């Protein structure tokens, strides 16, 4: 029974539970035209998805880099403002 | 609305009570 | 639970998130 228990290309659609980086990669954006939104010409075609995000997700999934989030503000060095000696000793 | 599970713990930095905070000691470096 | 309405709502939040991310001396 134990032996039987031991006996018993990748896809971007479903991923492993363990993350690689600051967060786990979310599910992809929905890439499908709704039946209202079908058009009859190449001219009226509505492109779907973002190819920058597609290539970035491809890199993260293939493991060439880890998933990180953007840092919009960095913590500034704590400083104290003082007046210069010449401006202190200016006399008029 | 704020979660009621939050509470405040003010620290009084007088003598004998809780530890003094990290102040600017540049005058005494 | 209309699937067309659910998919349209999902696409609406997706496009909203995409646009919101892309946007005296």
């Amino acid at each position: 029974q134990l032996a039987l228990q031991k006996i018993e290309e990748g896809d971007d659609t479903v991923l492993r539970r363990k993350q690689l980086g600051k967060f786990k990669l979310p599910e992809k954006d929905l890439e499908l035209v709704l039946p209202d939104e079908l058009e009859d010409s190449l001219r009226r075609l509505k492109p779907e998805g973002n190819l920058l995000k597609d290539r970035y997700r491809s890199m993260i999934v293939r493991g060439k880099l880890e998933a990180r989030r953007k840092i919009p503000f960095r913590k500034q060095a704590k400083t104290k403002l003082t007046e210069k000696w010449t401006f202190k000793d200016f006399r008029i | 609305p704020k979660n009621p599970l939050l509470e405040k713990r003010p620290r009084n930095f007088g003598i004998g009570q809780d530890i003094q905070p990290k102040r600017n000691l540049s005058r005494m470096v | 639970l209309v699937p067309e309405t659910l998919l349209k709502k999902r696409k609406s939040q997706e496009k909203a998130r995409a646009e919101r991310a892309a946007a005296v001396i």
Partner: protein
């Protein structure tokens, strides 16, 4: 006057649960044949809910707000009574002497105690009962 009554909050001072806070479910002053001394049937908290700050995610808050309870027959000599009182309607006759004699009733009793204590903790009241004692 009597103060080891129902809903009295006490501190466990001996055993594995030393330092934990309990509420009295049923006081037996006269004693039992199994316990020929003044004792009580109590329910309490073994693992207190963790600290929550303002910037934390709701999933982490819901994970850290869990409470691990326990039920116990405890001697009066191993209890330190408190002036606080925790009146909970869900704890009325949840455990008895027969509860500790067979295992299964202990886990459904602990499930009931966990549910009622988590409801009271999410209410935000009786904060002293859920903050752990520091000794």
């Amino acid at each position: 006057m009597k103060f080891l009554k129902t809903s009295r909050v006490c501190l466990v001072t001996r055993g594995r649960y030393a330092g934990k806070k309990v509420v009295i479910i049923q006081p037996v002053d006269q004693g039992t044949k199994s316990h020929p001394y003044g004792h009580a049937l109590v329910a309490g908290i073994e693992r207190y809910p963790s600290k929550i700050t303002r910037r934390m995610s709701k999933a982490r808050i819901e994970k850290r707000s869990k409470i691990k309870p326990f039920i116990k027959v405890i001697n009066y000599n191993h209890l330190m009574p408190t002036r606080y009182t925790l009146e909970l309607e869900g704890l009325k006759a949840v455990i008895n002497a027969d509860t500790f004699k067979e295992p299964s009733q202990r886990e459904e009793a602990k499930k009931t105690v966990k549910k009622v204590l988590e409801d009271r903790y999410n209410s935000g009241k009786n904060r002293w009962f859920f903050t752990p004692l520091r000794f």
